[PDB]
Amino acid sequence: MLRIIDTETCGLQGGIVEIASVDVIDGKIVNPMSHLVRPDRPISPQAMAIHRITEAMVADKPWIEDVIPHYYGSEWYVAHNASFDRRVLPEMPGEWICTMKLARRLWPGIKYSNMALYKTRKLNVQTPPGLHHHRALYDCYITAALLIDIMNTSGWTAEQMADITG
Amino acid sequence: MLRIIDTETCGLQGGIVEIASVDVIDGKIVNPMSHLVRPDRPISPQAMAIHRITEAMVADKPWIEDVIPHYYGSEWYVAHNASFDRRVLPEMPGEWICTMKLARRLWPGIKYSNMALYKTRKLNVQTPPGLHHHRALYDCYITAALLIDIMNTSGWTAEQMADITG
DNA sequence: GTCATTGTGGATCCGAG
DNA sequence: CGGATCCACAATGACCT
Ligand code: NA
Ligand code: NA
Ligand code: NA
Ligand code: NA
């Protein structure tokens, strides 16, 4: 089981306004989870233009510390550019896999943003209702679909993928 | 017809103690020739350990200029590291070909001494008894074998081989 | 001195919100 | 920011006796 994680933030230095995950088990996506989160700092307008989470949407929400333990319980955490989520999140109990590194290694010279990959790989995942690109749970479904594609294409195991991730 | 030339010397600066040649015609080695030569300087102990030619062996022999015209009569002069032989010999009336440059171009990262190439390429020619490796005529057979093998592998013409050489 | 191989500083572009 | 990826180069060595 691989747990795909995504985090929307106040900006590139961090502060968490949303987190979400799905699990990939036997080529299927299951066990969706998301929380809006009260950040440790103001949301920047540049970040707010991307994820469209306003201060009022998160004003009364739990802190990241309060919410992060619900995401414990996996050996493998997967993120698109996992470097980023690993930095901005509290320490996680597992090992990280980066689908960005994987994509670049599997298709040399491919464009390697999350949505560019999804578009070029012609993926089709059923996304959850009432969300959009750059809402955490939505992007989890994109990245999970990407990870499933990577695994079928390559035949890489969780271990090989962690090794490639470095 | 290509003429393989080898020289034994007093050391890396020159001084000629032996010269030898064979011709390669239609993939056959013919017309062996060799002269012991009186050098224009002392034979270094380092050189003597390689070729085993002594002062007493060369004391009454002709100078290199006396002997060198016997090796006229070819359009092509082949040597392994031809730069060396060209530097230490008087001027020759043809174009030079280096089997060492050719081998490195053909088989990069291979060890590229005369006898390493001969071994790695699994070559076998009739060699002349009475001599040993590092006598001039002996090493001529080794180099001629290498040349023939370079020619079959590569399909390069004499002119092309001379162009690669410089 | 040539040349395949090894190494490096630097410039540049990239992902993540 | 934390990385890749080229790129313009220098250094290494073998090679020849
Ligand atoms: Na993300
Ligand atoms: Na996202
Ligand atoms: Na020689
Ligand atoms: Na020799």
Author numbering:
A (entry chain C), B (entry chain D): 1 to 166
Excerpt from the paper describing this PDB structure:
ExoX is one of several redundant exonucleases involved in the mismatch repair system, UV repair, homologous recombination and the stabilization of tandem repeats in E. coli. Like TREX1/2, ExoX contains only an exonuclease domain; however, it can act on both ssDNA and dsDNA in a distributive manner and digests only one or two nucleotides per reaction cycle. To elucidate the mechanism by which dsDNA is recognized and processed by single-domain DnaQ members, such as ExoX and TREX1/2, we determined the structures of ExoX in complex with three distinct dsDNA substrates: 3′ overhanging duplex DNA, a 12 bp blunt-ended dsDNA and 5′ overhanging partially mismatched duplex DNA, referred to here as complexes I, II and III, respectively. The crystal structures obtained revealed that ExoX interacts with dsDNA via two DNA-binding sites, one for the substrate strand and another for the complementary strand.
In each asymmetrical unit, two protein molecules (A and B) bind to the ends of a single dsDNA molecule, thus forming a dumbbell-like structure. In complex I, the 3′ overhang is bent at an angle of 70 degrees between the first two nucleotides and extends into the active site. Outside the active site, a substrate DNA strand-binding site, mainly composed of Lys111, Tyr112 and Asn114 in the α5–α6 loop, interacts with the sugar–phosphate backbone of the substrate strand. Moreover, Lys101 and Arg104 of α5 form a specific positively charged binding site for the complementary strand. Most of the residues formed electrostatic interactions or hydrogen bonds with the DNA sugar–phosphate backbone, while few displayed electrostatic interactions or hydrogen bonding with DNA bases, which is indicative of a non–sequence-specific DNA-binding site. Strong density peaks were observed at the two conserved metal-binding sites of the DnaQ family, A and B. The intact substrate observed in our structure suggest that the metals involved are unlikely to be active metals (such as Mn2+ or Mg2+), and are probably inactive metals (such as Ni2+ or Na+). The ion bound at site A (MeA) is penta-coordinated by the side-chain oxygen atoms of Asp6, Glu8 and Asp139, one solvent water molecule and an oxygen atom of the substrate phosphate group, while the ion bound at site B (MeB) is hexa-coordinated by the side-chain oxygen atom of Asp6, three solvent water molecules and two oxygen atoms of the substrate phosphate group. The coordination of the two metal ions in ExoX is similar to that of the other members of the DEDDh subfamily, suggesting a classical phosphodiester bond cleavage mechanism for ExoX.
